Amino acid sequence: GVSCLCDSDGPSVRGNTLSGTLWLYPSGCPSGWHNCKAHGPTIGWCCKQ
């Protein structure tokens, strides 16, 4: 799958590395996921299950 930095990624904190998942879907997060990026990217989207 394709991961991306969540709002919780960047700093050195537990769970680090790009652990979320990006959705190319026009609204990002699919029903069954949650959300993990209130913003970036500016094309597709970034969420987490």
Side-chain angles (χ1 to χ4, degrees), residues 1 3-4 6 8-9 11-14 17-20 23-24 26 31 35-39 41-42:
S3 309
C4 54
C6 286
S8 186
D9 292 335
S12 45
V13 51
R14 44 173 275 256
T17 307
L18 72 183
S19 192
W23 282 98
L24 326 179
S31 188
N35 69 86
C36 86
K37 284 293 293 298
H39 288 323
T42 170

Side-chain angles (χ1 to χ4, degrees), residues 29-30 32-36 47-49:
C29 214
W33 281 59
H34 185 185
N35 69 86
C36 86
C47 193
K48 64 164 100 67
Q49 221 187 323

